C-alpha cells in the first residue's frame, strides 16, 4: 500500500519504467519510419482496396 | 561505373513514376500532404538526374 521501497515494490517500479520507455523507444523508432511518404501511401492504398 | 549511373538514372525515373502514381492517388484521396511529398521528391531526383 505504501509504495515505499520494498523487495516487491522496488522491482515493480523499475520494470514498469522499462516497459514504458521501451514502448516509447519503439514508438520513436516507428515514427521516423512513419514519417516517410511511402509508408503513408500504403495505408491510403489499403483503405481503398479494403472498401472494394 | 557508367552502367551503374545509367541504372541509377533509370531507377530515379522509375522512382519518380512510382511517386507519380501516389500523387495521382493522393488527388483522388484528397489529402494535400501526400501530394506535396511527391513533388519535393520529384525535384531532388530531377536535380540528381541532371547532375548524373
Curated annotation (Swiss-Prot), chain B:
This is Membrane-associated protein Vipp1. It comes from Nostoc punctiforme (strain ATCC 29133 / PCC 73102). Belongs to the PspA/Vipp/IM30 family. A membrane remodeling protein capable of forming rings and/or filaments on membranes, which then curve and tubulate the bilayer. Rings will form on liposomes, altering their positive curvature so the lipid bilayer is remodeled into a negative curve as the membrane enters the ring. Ring stacks of varying lengths can be seen joining isolated liposomes. A lipid monolayer can be drawn into the center of the rings. Required for thylakoid formation. Polymerizes to form rings, filaments and ribbons. Rings are formed by stacked rungs that tilt to give a dome-shaped curvature. Rings form with symmetries ranging from C11 (55 subunits) to C17 (119 subunits). A helical hairpin is formed by residues 25-137 which is conserved in all known ESCRT-III proteins. Helix 5N-5C (residues 193-217) contacts the helical hairpin 3 subunits away and is essential for oligomerization. The C-terminal flexible linker and alpha-helix 6 (residues 220-256) are not required for oligomerization and do not resolve in electron microscopy. It is found in: Cell inner membrane.
Amino acid at each position: 500500500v505504501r509504495g515505499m521501497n520494498t523487495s516487491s515494490a522496488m522491482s515493480a517500479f523499475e520494470r514498469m519504467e522499462e516497459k514504458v520507455l521501451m514502448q516509447e523507444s519503439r514508438a520513436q523508432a516507428l515514427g521516423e519510419l512513419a514519417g516517410a511518404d511511402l509508408e503513408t501511401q500504403f495505408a491510403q492504398l489499403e483503405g481503398g482496396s479494403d472498401v472494394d | 561505373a557508367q552502367k551503374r549511373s545509367e541504372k541509377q538514372y533509370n531507377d530515379a525515373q522509375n522512382e519518380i513514376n512510382k511517386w507519380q502514381r501516389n500523387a495521382q492517388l493522393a488527388l483522388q484521396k484528397g489529402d494535400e500532404n501526400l501530394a506535396r511529398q511527391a513533388l519535393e521528391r520529384k525535384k531532388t531526383y530531377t536535380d540528381t538526374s541532371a547532375a548524373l
